[PDB]
Amino acid sequence: IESIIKTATDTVKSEINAELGVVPSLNAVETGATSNTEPEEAIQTRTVINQHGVSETLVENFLSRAALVSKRSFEYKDHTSSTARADKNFFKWTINTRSFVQLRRKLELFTYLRFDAEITILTTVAVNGSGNNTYVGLPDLTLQAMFVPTGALTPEKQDSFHWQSGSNASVFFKISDPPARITIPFMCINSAYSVFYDGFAGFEKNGLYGINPADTIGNLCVRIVNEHQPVGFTVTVRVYMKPKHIKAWAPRPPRTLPYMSIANANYKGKERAPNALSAIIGNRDSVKTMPHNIVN
Amino acid sequence: IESIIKTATDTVKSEINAELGVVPSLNAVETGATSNTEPEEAIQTRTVINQHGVSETLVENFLSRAALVSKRSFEYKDHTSSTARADKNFFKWTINTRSFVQLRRKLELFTYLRFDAEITILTTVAVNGSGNNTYVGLPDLTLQAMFVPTGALTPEKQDSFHWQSGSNASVFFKISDPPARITIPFMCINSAYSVFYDGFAGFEKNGLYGINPADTIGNLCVRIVNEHQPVGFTVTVRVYMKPKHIKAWAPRPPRTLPYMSIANANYKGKERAPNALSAIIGNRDSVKTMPHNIVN
Amino acid sequence: NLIVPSESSDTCSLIGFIAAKDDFSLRLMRDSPDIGQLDHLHAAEAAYQ
Amino acid sequence: SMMEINNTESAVGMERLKVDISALTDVDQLLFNIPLDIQLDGPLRNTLVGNISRYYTHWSGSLEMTFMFCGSFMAAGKLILCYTPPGGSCPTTRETAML
Amino acid sequence: SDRVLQLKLGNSAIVTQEAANYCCAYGEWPNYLPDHEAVAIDKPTQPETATDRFYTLKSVKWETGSTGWWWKLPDALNNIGMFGQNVQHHYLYRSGFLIHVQCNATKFHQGALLVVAIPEHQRGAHNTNTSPGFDDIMKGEEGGTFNHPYVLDDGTSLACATIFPHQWINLRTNNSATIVLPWMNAAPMDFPLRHNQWTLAIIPVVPLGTRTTSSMVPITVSIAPMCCEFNGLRHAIT
Amino acid sequence: SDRVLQLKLGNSAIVTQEAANYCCAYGEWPNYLPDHEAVAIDKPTQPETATDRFYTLKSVKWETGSTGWWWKLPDALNNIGMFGQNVQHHYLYRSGFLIHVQCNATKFHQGALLVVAIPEHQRGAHNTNTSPGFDDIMKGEEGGTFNHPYVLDDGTSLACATIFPHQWINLRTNNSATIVLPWMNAAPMDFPLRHNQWTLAIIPVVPLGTRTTSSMVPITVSIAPMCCEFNGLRHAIT
Amino acid sequence: INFYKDSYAASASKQDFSQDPSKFTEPVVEGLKAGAPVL
Amino acid sequence: INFYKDSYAASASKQDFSQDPSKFTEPVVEGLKAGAPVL
């Protein structure tokens, strides 16, 4: 039944029981219900007034933490002789929560999630080695982070006119300023994000499995506004996400085997236990062997 | 008896006393009580209205001061050819209050303590000598301080994935910003920290004596977020602790002999007085010798 | 003892489950040791292309 | 959630999630034991309570262990399950564990 | 309704799904010694859950030629746990008991055990004028076996043993028996090392039989002292 | 009036005709653990008179060069009588203490003993970085002696030891000291075999002296646990 | 402190202490009484 | 000024002026009156 729970439940003292027809310790697992055997019915207890709070396990508290979701390093320099695949003073990132495993596993503890997302961008800069074998100092550069909806037109170069950002939300920030922060609303076309999706997002048979683009927040396009300096630098941008105003539905078995890809739940497991395909828990000598037995 | 004391007690005027059976100046130390002889009963006094405040000796005021608890210097550079024991752009510190003696002695004036801990982190940087015999300037670096519970997984390298900090509290701060500050709650599994512990924290006989890990706040893992510069620097991080919301129980004899270790109360004493094992107070010629006698 | 007739299986299995009661509580959240990575996952780079 | 009591070599996959019991010809024999540390690796780690709790450092409260017998209808037997509070070695005889 | 039963005392609990009610000896329930019947004037110690809990004895094997088994109280419990320690440190003891006898078998097995609590079971020897010795009577936790269960080892009849508090474990019907014993003595308190108020006797009136594959069929006894109190504290003697 | 005192607990009684009041540590009295502070949920056992009684330790001899003696609680009592048995059979223990230290001499003798109960007396070693070992700390009923009573064996001062509950036995004034100790711990209950809440220290601040014919002058310690309760029953471990 | 015009900009909401474990622990149409046999 | 949601984040509390020195100075079961001999 629904009730407001702020502290752990109290224990009431209990006496001897010798009653026919009453077996609180016996249960029927086959029904799918969890055993209702209380400590008062299993042993003789005292009275305990429990003042232990339960607020730290609140779903909001459990998930509302800034977790690293993106890390991208790129060279800030003249990119005339750079390869096509290189990030020429700017990068684009399709936003996802599946690249860093701690937050991914925490989110995947649930089937459905609804939250707004606080986004924090932290920038660091270093002077390139083997480009100029000397140090002069770190410039205070200005960066532009533009939100572009998934599939929409992204900038093709650092000085592209697409950065004019007529309607796209853009944030300009300096390396010397505190990390930039913006709140993105819950943007799913459905009432909740689908953490897991058992289907195909296309009307033909060649669409991606387990991927619902309605659950992709969008694209983040980050550029250095400053034109290049005579010497080269390496700029690393870290994007952190913190869910807030969270609602969660249908908890799931936690991930055990290591993640393989950000696109699927494919599994291989470790070579040996723990967290191997044939053995999740580490082995002991026998079911009669106590691993950390106290011996005096 | 319990009473609210804000100022020192007043003195009342007194007259001559020649009463049989009344000896206020005589006491019995053997009972363990402190003498109750008032100045009014020992001499003839005047009336004095005492307005002297007592607030500066309040336990809260006595202990709620930012005291240095940790100081760690490490090189910020390319650590490819560095030794294993060296701090390669990051360090880990098991939090304790026993390394710097002023705060340690103040805390050890009590048997039990309960407080939240304000933590302030101050960073300084210098250009390495004998590495590059020149000065170019001081970079404005970003540092990450991650709280890791005692015994839990700590990062093994500067760019380790463990720094992603899915659930661990992490603070990012710049050298140019004011010193970072966070409040850690009273985290002991008991109702109070045990400043002294007369026991062993293990169920076998080889556990550490006098160490209760329930009284260890945790581990602080500090890294430079920036990748290394072409030249080397020396970065010094100082951690200061200030107890607050303090409750104190069972005051103790103050430490006299110099501390030897942060792990025990082992003592050796100075070679000679003062604060020597066989003589705490410095010597005088005789019990009839006045050390600083006024002679005119 | 475990006593079965000849027609039944002579070896029988037990399944053990564990749960916490409602007097149970947790404190001092920390990163789970049960998951970790030493490298970027597959297709993580493709999100930047 | 299911305990992995049979966390031994030669027990592969699903076989780790059940404990086999046979007819014995000596009385009061031990069948198995379970360590109760929900922080280290062990039979309780890959459970809902274990997995959620390992996201935290401090824990309090009572636990419940439920055992379902999956033999035939004709199978009969009596077992004894004992929790021993810490301080000494794990009991290896019934007359000690029943205390 | 009357087939399932849970007994919970102290930190111990037993469940049975094939019980047949349970017996309260002479319609009584154990209780502490009241002031109007007390003799010893020192304040007694009442350990409650430390001693009033189920202690399980070593199981014995039901065989084809088994004659029966017996245990004497409090002698069988005199060296077990906190009950044993309290007995060894105190001159005077008083308590009742809750006895639970367990024996299961298949639906193809047959057998009938009389589980009888005999008050003051003064044993006799066979074919001699010499009285039974201390070692013949005082067997401790292991207990003993009947030499001639037909005459209850005392020249009386097994057929008339039903006058005493008792149940039957009939394998086709039930797999456990439960008997509640109050304090039964001429004196309010007694020295626990020299006198035995009760004797639990398990006698196979109908022998164990089957034609399936044979298995070991043990009989297990769990005894919980009740309303334990002790007087006359001194050094342990055992 | 304040010179004679009778202490009666359980079956034990002590009389003194030369007491000097008696000390209640921090103005408190021992009590059972209340429900609003309890943690362990099992029903505790409260042996009352079986454990809350005076146990007398082995006397020690006051000599001219004596440095002092110490005992640790509950370690000194952990193998004595029903208190010891309850400690050995239970994971958790809780109690206070009533300490009575006895030392008499003639009116021609002089001497002064500080009898101080130190909470959490974490001992230190002398002239080494190695922490004291298990055997250095855990001495049982025999107890130990001070290596450097001037610094209380912990780098602090003996002169400031009066901040702790204490009495003095001054031979010209009194022949006994009495201290009442409540439960003193960060946790409501503790494992009695690994942590010691209290340390009784008897330190001869003024050495024994006389010019009459010398006689052995012993010091005797009697400790009565108070409001004993135990949790977590299991097999004895000791 | 929230001076923004959009409600989703607000800080987190850690005040929802309502629980219903029975939707996961006892999802049976016929409730199970304590002591009484389940079957 | 405390806009944080956790009470332990607040500044220090230097308002507790209650004292009871007798728990350290006179921990005797029988109180000692002024002037009257202790013994």
Angstrom distance (rounded) from CA A284 to CA D4 = 11
Q: Are strands C2-3 and D56-60 parallel, antiparallel or unpaired?
A: unpaired
Provide the CA C37 distance to its chain's centre, in angstroms.
Answer: 19
Counting CB pairs under 8 A, whether chains B and H reach 3 or more, is yes
Is E82 within 8 Å of chain F by CB?
yes
Chain F residues 168-187 with CB within 8 Å of chain B:
168-170, 173-174, 177, 184, 186-187
Contact list in E for residue D66 (CB cut-off 8 A) is none
Resolution in A: 2.0
Contact list in D for residue A106 (CB cut-off 8 A) is 55
Q: Which residues of B touch H (CB under 8 A)?
A: 1-6, 19, 22-24, 26-28, 31-34, 36, 38, 41, 54-55, 58-61, 64, 116, 183, 185-186, 244-245, 251
Mutate to test the interface with B, among A125, A181, A242 (most CBs of B within 10 A): A125
What count of other Cβ atoms lies within 10 Å of the Cβ of residue F232?
20
Angstrom distance (rounded) from CA A267 to CA A251 = 20
Contact F191 D87 (CB under 8 A): yes
Contact A2 G13 (CB under 8 A): no
Going by C-beta distance under 8 Å and a sequence separation of 6 or more, which residues neighbour residue D78? C1, E102, E104, E175, E220
Contact list in B for residue F158 (CB cut-off 8 A) is 253
How close does chain C come to D94, measured CA to CA in Å?
13
In terms of Cα–Cα distance, which of E51, E21, E14, E15 is closest to E178? Answer: E21
Contact A21 E98 (CB under 8 A): no
How close does chain A come to G29, measured CA to CA in Å?
10
Angstrom distance (rounded) from CA E155 to CA E144 = 18
Helix (H) or strand (E) holding B105: helix B101-108
Angstrom distance (rounded) from CA C49 to CA B213 = 49
Task: Read off the DSSP letter of residue B59.
Answer: H
CA angle B93, B94, B98 (to 5 degrees): 110
Mutate to test the interface with F, among D83, D84, D93 (most CBs of F within 10 A): D84
Nearest chain D residue to A31 by CA distance is D68
Cβ contacts from A onto C, under 8 A? 81
Contact list in B for residue C31 (CB cut-off 8 A) is 152-153, 162, 165-168
Counting CB pairs under 8 A, whether chains C and D reach 3 or more, is yes
Angstrom distance (rounded) from CA B220 to CA B95 = 7
Counting CB pairs under 8 A, whether chains B and E reach 3 or more, is no
Counting CB pairs under 8 A, whether chains F and B reach 3 or more, is yes
Angstrom distance (rounded) from CA A110 to CA A192 = 12
Instruction: Identify whether the C-beta of residue F182 lies closer than 8 Å to the C-beta of residue F96.
Output: yes
Mutate to test the interface with F, among E45, E87, E91 (most CBs of F within 10 A): E45
Angstrom distance (rounded) from CA F86 to CA F119 = 23
Angstrom distance (rounded) from CA E104 to CA E110 = 11
Is F70 within 8 Å of chain B by CB?
no
Angstrom distance (rounded) from CA A63 to CA G13 = 12
How close does chain H come to B2, measured CA to CA in Å?
5
Contact list in F for residue B111 (CB cut-off 8 A) is 119-120
Angstrom distance (rounded) from CA D94 to CA F128 = 47
Instruction: Identify whether the C-beta of residue A71 lies closer than 8 Å to the C-beta of residue A34.
Output: no
Contact A20 E10 (CB under 8 A): no
- Which pair of tokens denotes residue A74? 């790129």
Taking the CA atoms of residue E112, residue E113, residue E119 and residue E124 in that order, the dihedral angle to the nearest 10 degrees is 100
Cβ contacts from C onto E, under 8 A? 23
Is G17 within 8 Å of chain A by CB?
yes
Contact list in D for residue E61 (CB cut-off 8 A) is 27
In whole angstroms, how far apart are CA E187 and each of A96, C12, E193, E197, E232?
83, 51, 15, 11, 16
Task: List the beta bridge partners of residue B53.
Answer: B7
Helix (H) or strand (E) holding B148: strand B142-148
Is D89 within 8 Å of chain C by CB?
no
Contact F235 D86 (CB under 8 A): no
Angstrom distance (rounded) from CA B66 to CA B117 = 10
Q: What's the sign of the alpha-carbon dihedral H19, H24, H28, H30?
A: negative
Side chain identity at residue A206, one-letter code: N
* Exposure b/e, B23-32, CB count within 10 A at least 16 = b: ebeebbbbbb
Contact list in H for residue F24 (CB cut-off 8 A) is 27-29
Residue-by-residue DSSP string for chain A: --EE--BPPPB-----B--BT--TT---GGGSPPP---HHHHS-B--B----B-GGG-HHHHH-S-EEEEEEEEEES--TT--TTS-SSEEEEE--S-SSHHHHHHHHTEEEEEEEEEEEEEEEEEEPTTTSSS-------EEEEEEE-TTSPPPSSTT-GGGG-SSS-EEEEESSSPPEEEEE----SSSSEESS--SBSSSSTTSPBT--GGG---EEEEEE-SPPPSS-EEEEEEEEEEEEEEEEEEE-PPP-SPP-BSSS-----BSSSSSBSS-SSPPBS-TT--TT----
Domain ranges of chain G: 1-39
What count of other Cβ atoms lies within 10 Å of the Cβ of residue D77?
16
Residue-by-residue DSSP string for E221-236: EEEEEEEEEEEEE---
In terms of Cα–Cα distance, which of C5, D78, D24 is closest to E17? Answer: D78
Angstrom distance (rounded) from CA A66 to CA A103 = 9
Contact E6 A44 (CB under 8 A): no
CA angle E229, E232, E238 (to 5 degrees): 90
Is F122 within 8 Å of chain B by CB?
yes
How close does chain F come to D55, measured CA to CA in Å?
23
Select from B136, B170, B205 the Cβ nearest to the Cβ of A135.
B136
Select from F3, F25, F27 the Cβ nearest to the Cβ of H39.
F3
DSSP reduced 3-state for F91: strand
Contact list in H for residue F175 (CB cut-off 8 A) is none
Quickly tell me which residue has 């540092």 as its tokens. B143
Going by C-beta distance under 8 Å and a sequence separation of 6 or more, which residues neighbour residue E36? none
- Which pair of tokens denotes residue F130? 């190695």
In whole angstroms, how far apart are CA F141 and each of A117, F56, F84?
64, 10, 11
Q: Are strands E23-24 and E176-181 parallel, antiparallel or unpaired?
A: parallel
Q: Which residues of E touch C (CB under 8 A)?
A: 104-109, 212-213, 215-218
* Exposure b/e, E162-183, CB count within 10 A at least 16 = b: eebbbbbbbbeebbbbbbbbbb
Task: List the beta bridge partners of residue D60.
Answer: C25
What count of other Cβ atoms lies within 10 Å of the Cβ of residue F139?
15
Cβ contacts from A onto G, under 8 A? 77
Counting beta carbons within 10 angstroms of the beta carbon of residue E159, is it exposed (0 to 12), middle (13 to 18) or buried (19 or more)?
A: exposed
Angstrom distance (rounded) from CA D71 to CA D58 = 38
Experimental method: cryo-EM
CA angle A254, A260, A261 (to 5 degrees): 100
Quickly tell me which residue has 């572009």 as its tokens. A148
Angstrom distance (rounded) from CA F94 to CA F38 = 11
Angstrom distance (rounded) from CA A16 to CA E65 = 39
Domain ranges of chain F: 5-233
Is E49 within 8 Å of chain F by CB?
yes
Instruction: Identify whether the C-beta of residue A88 lies closer than 8 Å to the C-beta of residue A158.
Output: yes
Domain ranges of chain A: 1-296
Taking the CA atoms of residue B104, residue H16, residue B121 and residue B151 in that order, the dihedral angle to the nearest 10 degrees is 60
Contact list in F for residue A44 (CB cut-off 8 A) is 42-43
Angstrom distance (rounded) from CA F111 to CA F218 = 13
Contact B148 C30 (CB under 8 A): yes
In whole angstroms, how far apart are CA F180 and each of E80, F123, F191, F225, H29?
35, 23, 22, 10, 10
Provide the CA F203 distance to its chain's centre, in angstroms.
Answer: 13
Contact list in H for residue B40 (CB cut-off 8 A) is none
Fold of E5-233: Jelly Rolls (2.60.120)
Angstrom distance (rounded) from CA A209 to CA A201 = 7
Angstrom distance (rounded) from CA E13 to CA A45 = 13
Contact G26 A183 (CB under 8 A): no
DSSP reduced 3-state for E134: helix
Cβ contacts from A onto D, under 8 A? 84
Contact A91 C47 (CB under 8 A): no
Contact A283 D87 (CB under 8 A): no
